Amino acid sequence: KIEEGKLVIWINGDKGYNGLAEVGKKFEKDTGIKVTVEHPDKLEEKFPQVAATGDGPDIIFWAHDRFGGYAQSGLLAEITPAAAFQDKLYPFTWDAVRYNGKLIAYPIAVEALSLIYNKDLLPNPPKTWEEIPALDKELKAKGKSALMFNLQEPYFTWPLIAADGGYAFKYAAGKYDIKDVGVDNAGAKAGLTFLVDLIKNKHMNADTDYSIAEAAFNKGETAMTINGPWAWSNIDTSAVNYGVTVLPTFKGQPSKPFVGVLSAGINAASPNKELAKEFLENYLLTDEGLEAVNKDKPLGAVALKSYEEELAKDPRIAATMENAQKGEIMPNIPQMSAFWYAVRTAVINAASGRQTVDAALAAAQTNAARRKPSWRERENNRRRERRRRAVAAKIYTGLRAQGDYNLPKHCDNNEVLKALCVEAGWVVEEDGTTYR
Amino acid sequence: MKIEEGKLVIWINGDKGYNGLAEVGKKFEKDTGIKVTVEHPDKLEEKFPQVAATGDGPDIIFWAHDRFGGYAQSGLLAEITPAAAFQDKLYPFTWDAVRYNGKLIAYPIAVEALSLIYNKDLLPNPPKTWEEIPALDKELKAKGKSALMFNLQEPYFTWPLIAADGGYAFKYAAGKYDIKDVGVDNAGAKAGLTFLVDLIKNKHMNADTDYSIAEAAFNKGETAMTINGPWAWSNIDTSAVNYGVTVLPTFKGQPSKPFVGVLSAGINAASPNKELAKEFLENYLLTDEGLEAVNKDKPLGAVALKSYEEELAKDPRIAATMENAQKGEIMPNIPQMSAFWYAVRTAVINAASGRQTVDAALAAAQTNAARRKPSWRERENNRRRERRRRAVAAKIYTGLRAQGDYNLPKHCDNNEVLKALCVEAGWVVEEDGTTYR
DNA sequence: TTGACACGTGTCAAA
DNA sequence: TTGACACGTGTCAAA
Numbered sequence: 041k042i043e044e045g046k047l048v049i050w051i052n053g054d055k056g057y058n059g060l061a062e063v064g065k066k067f068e069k070d071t072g073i074k075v076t077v078e079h080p081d082k083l084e085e086k087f088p089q090v091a092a093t094g095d096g097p098d099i100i101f102w103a104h105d106r107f108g109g110y111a112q113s114g115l116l117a118e119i120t121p122a123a124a125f126q127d128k129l130y131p132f133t134w135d136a137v138r139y140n141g142k143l144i145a146y147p148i149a150v151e152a153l154s155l156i157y158n159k160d161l162l163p164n165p166p167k168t169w170e171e172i173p174a175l176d177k178e179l180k181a182k183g184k185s186a187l188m189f190n191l192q193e194p195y196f197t198w199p200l201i202a203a204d205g206g207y208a209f210k211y212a213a214g215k216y217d218i219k220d221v222g223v224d225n226a227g228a229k230a231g232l233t234f235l236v237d238l239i240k241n242k243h244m245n246a247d248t249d250y251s252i253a254e255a256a257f258n259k260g261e262t263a264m265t266i267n268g269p270w271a272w273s274n275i276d277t278s279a280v281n282y283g284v285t286v287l288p289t290f291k292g293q294p295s296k297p298f299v300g301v302l303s304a305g306i307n308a309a310s311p312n313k314e315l316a317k318e319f320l321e322n323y324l325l326t327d328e329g330l331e332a333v334n335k336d337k338p339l340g341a342v343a344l345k346s347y348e349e350e351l352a353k354d355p356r357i358a359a360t361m362e363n364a365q366k367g368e369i370m371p372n373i374p375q376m377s378a379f380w381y382a383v384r385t386a387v388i389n390a391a392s393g394r395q396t397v398d399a400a401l402a403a404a405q406t407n408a409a410r411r412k413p414s415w416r417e418r419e420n421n422r423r424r425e426r427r428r429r430a431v432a433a434k435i436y437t438g439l440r441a442q443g444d445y446n447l448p449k450h451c452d453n454n455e456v457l458k459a460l461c462v463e464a465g466w467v468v469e470e471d472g473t474t475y476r
Numbered sequence: 477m478k479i480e481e482g483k484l485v486i487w488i489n490g491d492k493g494y495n496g497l498a499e500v501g502k503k504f505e506k507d508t509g510i511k512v513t514v515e516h517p518d519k520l521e522e523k524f525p526q527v528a529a530t531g532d533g534p535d536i537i538f539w540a541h542d543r544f545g546g547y548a549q550s551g552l553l554a555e556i557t558p559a560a561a562f563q564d565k566l567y568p569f570t571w572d573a574v575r576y577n578g579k580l581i582a583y584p585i586a587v588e589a590l591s592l593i594y595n596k597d598l599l600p601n602p603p604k605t606w607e608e609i610p611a612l613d614k615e616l617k618a619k620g621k622s623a624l625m626f627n628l629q630e631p632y633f634t635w636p637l638i639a640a641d642g643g644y645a646f647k648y649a650a651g652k653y654d655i656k657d658v659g660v661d662n663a664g665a666k667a668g669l670t671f672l673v674d675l676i677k678n679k680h681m682n683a684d685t686d687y688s689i690a691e692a693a694f695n696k697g698e699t700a701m702t703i704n705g706p707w708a709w710s711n712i713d714t715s716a717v718n719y720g721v722t723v724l725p726t727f728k729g730q731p732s733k734p735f736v737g738v739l740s741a742g743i744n745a746a747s748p749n750k751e752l753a754k755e756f757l758e759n760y761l762l763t764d765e766g767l768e769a770v771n772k773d774k775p776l777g778a779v780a781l782k783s784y785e786e787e788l789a790k791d792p793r794i795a796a797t798m799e800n801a802q803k804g805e806i807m808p809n810i811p812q813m814s815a816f817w818y819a820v821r822t823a824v825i826n827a828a829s830g831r832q833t834v835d836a837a838l839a840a841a842q843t844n845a846a847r848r849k850p851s852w853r854e855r856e857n858n859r860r861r862e863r864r865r866r867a868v869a870a871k872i873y874t875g876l877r878a879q880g881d882y883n884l885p886k887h888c889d890n891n892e893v894l895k896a897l898c899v900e901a902g903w904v905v906e907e908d909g910t911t912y913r
Numbered sequence: 914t915t916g917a918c919a920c921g922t923g924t925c926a927a928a
Numbered sequence: 929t930t931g932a933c934a935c936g937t938g939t940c941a942a943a
């Protein structure tokens with residue numbers, strides 16, 4: 041729970057949380073406010089469960105796509121930076137964090153997936169997904185593999201699903217059609233089918249996750265991985281000479297990654313809303329602030345103009361933004377959570393062979409549009425069945441007390457029902473078959 | 477994931493030296509040509525029973541010995557058949573830790589006990605008792621620091637204090653553990669948990685403090701003390717902290733009694749590489765060079781291998797570990813241990829957060845720790861009885877609806893069919909179901 | 914031990 | 929949209 045005078049921050053465990061803790065420390069020495077940074081597991085899921093009751097951190101860091109739902113639920117404090125501060129950031133990073141006309145978080149950095157490759161094993165990375173199988177057969181003879189990346193999170197597979205035409209929610213007339221899903225069209229199918237065939241032909245393992253892929257690449261066992269800018273520092277500490285480049289094409293079309301905007305939202309339940317703005321605006325979103333974080337784990341293309349003109353000169357950032365130009369900014373609508381869950385189930389289920397690609401994506405389609413039942417809807421159902429049982433119970437209480445039926449000492453209401461049937465001229469067999 | 481012939485896949489917890497173990501796998505691969513993959517998935521001790529039931533899961537699984545009896549009872553593990561010669565290379569009591577129903581069910585690797593870890597520069601003289609920790613915290617807070625921080629989300633770390641004044645899991649008597657004699661609700665257990673909850677109430681600790689929050693604060697020099705196992709020393713070493721490892725503090729004048737774990741390696745009963753796994757474990761891992769490679773990554777504690785433990789026992793930190801281990805007890809490996817752990821975890825978390833009182837949390841924990849898990853057949857008995865109860869009712873109402881002629885609306889529920897039946901039989905049924913003649 | 918009935922959410926469908 | 933009945937596990941009790 042939040043309490044006046046201190047600041048607690050939640051950020052994902054793959055971001056530079058020590059670097060950010062360094063920013064809170066300098067914030068503590070200047071103002072005397074202690075700042076604790078924490079990287080709990082599944083924080084994008086825990087926050088909406090505890091913020092409702094008033095708990096959660098002061099600030100929550102995540103990509104912009106989850107913030108619309110948070111705001112829809114009233115969990116986020118409206119952000120109102122002065123004009124002078126708004127002009128410090130690229131306008132399009134502000135667009136990413138505006139929901140229903142209001143700013144619901146501070147944008148931090150732009151993230152896109154790129155192809156990361158081992159220049160020593162692979163001086164010339166492939167330009168196409170199609171040549172990866174042959175490349176893997178060649179490397180497998182030397183004890184290596186072509187490509188490993190996280191298959192448990194649809195974020196990493198979506199660039200390939202969207203290459204040939206797959207899309208989450210169609211954008212038309214200036215809006216997102218919560219009810220036009222493109223996870224089951226020919227383009228999406230072709231992409232997921234190629235990925236599953238990679239597994240069938242034993243070029244990838246269905247159970248490969250984030251840490252397995254990162255280990256294999258950082259140890260030099262795989263020639264390529266797909267990851268974001270946060271991964272670079274761990275490769276830097278390794279003996280691998282890597283390059284960051286454009287993702288491969290599929291059927292001649294570019295891979296289209298979903299582009300994330302790492303953002304910091306303020307808990308509407310927080311008693312330190314002003315202290316959090318002072319920290320975010322005048323400590324984190326500064327050259328020295330982002331630098332301290334970026335030096336920990338690279339941020340990507342930061343939203344702060346003054347510091348991005350520097351980072352934009354890193355060829356790895358230029359490749360990140362090359363991939364981001366071919367991708368799309370993720371929607372922030374509340375249904376993005378349902379989209380991500382459904383597509384996650386589809387990828388995992390087709391990769392494992394539990395479902396065909398057709399069946400997996402067919403179900404993902406309906407799931408990604410499925411509306412979550414409201415609290416009142418659940419309560420209507422719960423009360424109806426309560427009522428249904430209470431009415432029956434009172435009828436059988438009456439039959440038992442006044443029926444004077446020949447019932448055993450202990451018997452269920454089916455037996456009472458039977459004695460009521462017999463009384464009313466009915467015959468009831470052992471299995472319930474009933475007639476006059 | 478399924479195990480494939482000619483390959484080895486290993487599961488080991490993320491806080492152990494899985495990079496060192498991979499190096500051992502790399503040697504195995506070089507001498508025999510068998511690839512070895514080390515993974516450290518989350519919640520592996522829960523995932524293994526789920527996947528292994530159908531033949532999935534890794535070839536080898538590393539965990540403390542307390543989970544393995546349940547795996548064996550479920551048929552998930554291969555019987556370990558080390559020649560008498562090889563068994564004599566490990567301390568007998570480590571073999572006891574992995575013996576279940578007379579059979580050995582895993583290779584013991586290392587002995588783990590929690591110790592008190594303190595910052596020599598902030599705290600040259602560590603406290604001897606839990607009681608003096610609140611005063612110590614008051615001093616340090618005036619310097620911007622705290623006295624003690626440790627994982628409150630896993631009961632393993634709080635159990636030494638709960639056991640100190642008398643708490644216990646399952647009573648040992650007549651050469652076996654009594655599954656119906658649980659001691660998480662006696663006066664000793666209540667005193668221990670009450671003192672911990674008082675630390676939180678008095679702002680000396682945070683209820684939400686987990687493993688990484690505690691590790692980060694100690695390793696960054698914000699708290700003078702932590703409680704942890706040997707695996708944690710290497711991260712402290714790389715930090716700027718000058719630390720010692722010593723005996724846990726006493727509570728009510730009695731020693732803290734940590735539950736002692738034996739990190740152990742079981743072989744998946746479904747593995748077609750049982751021989752390769754035995755070769756890797758017996759002749760590559762459980763060797764001086766093998767455990768050295770793992771121990772270099774993250775300290776194993778006091779290894780089961782006699783030859784190499786004579787080297788590790790020279791380390792004062794191991795001497796402190798074993799001092800605490802002598803004061804604790806080897807964990808049971810009985811299947812009921814998972815239920816004991818879940819119960820105590822819920823009690824500790826609910827008490828520390830104020831969601832439940834100590835007495836009420838521990839009362840529920842006692843019932844839960846002793847509760848027998850219903851068998852598959854018990855569940856199936858219940859499921860089929862209710863299926864049959866509904867099927868009989870549905871046939872009756874199907875017959876009432878077909879031959880009744882009760883004059884019912886197009887759509888109505890069986891309560892209305894019942895009501896019609898009642899009036900046909902000379903009854904009157906009110907709106908809420910009130911029924912009489 | 915077995916077993917009556919409660920419980921809230923799932924499946925299927927009419928509208 | 930609301931709503932019938934299914935569904936398996938929980939609560940409570942008799943023995």
Ligand SMILES: OC[C@H]1O[C@H](O[C@H]2[C@H](O)[C@@H](O)[C@@H](O)O[C@@H]2CO)[C@H](O)[C@@H](O)[C@@H]1O
Pocket residue numbers: 052054084103104105106151193194195196300380
């Ligand atoms: O996999 C679905 C997941 O994708 C995105 O999450 C990214 C996140 O943006 C990155 O910062 C990084 O941590 O990797 C994540 C993928 O594991 C979405 O932002 C997220 O909402 C979604 O669940």
Ligand SMILES: OC[C@H]1O[C@H](O[C@H]2[C@H](O)[C@@H](O)[C@@H](O)O[C@@H]2CO)[C@H](O)[C@@H](O)[C@@H]1O
Pocket residue numbers: 489491521540541542543588630631632633705737817
């Ligand atoms: O907290 C309950 C938990 O305790 C033990 O787990 C230890 C494990 O023994 C150590 O090796 C280390 O990893 O820390 C763990 C606690 O986080 C039991 O072995 C385990 O079964 C039990 O659930």
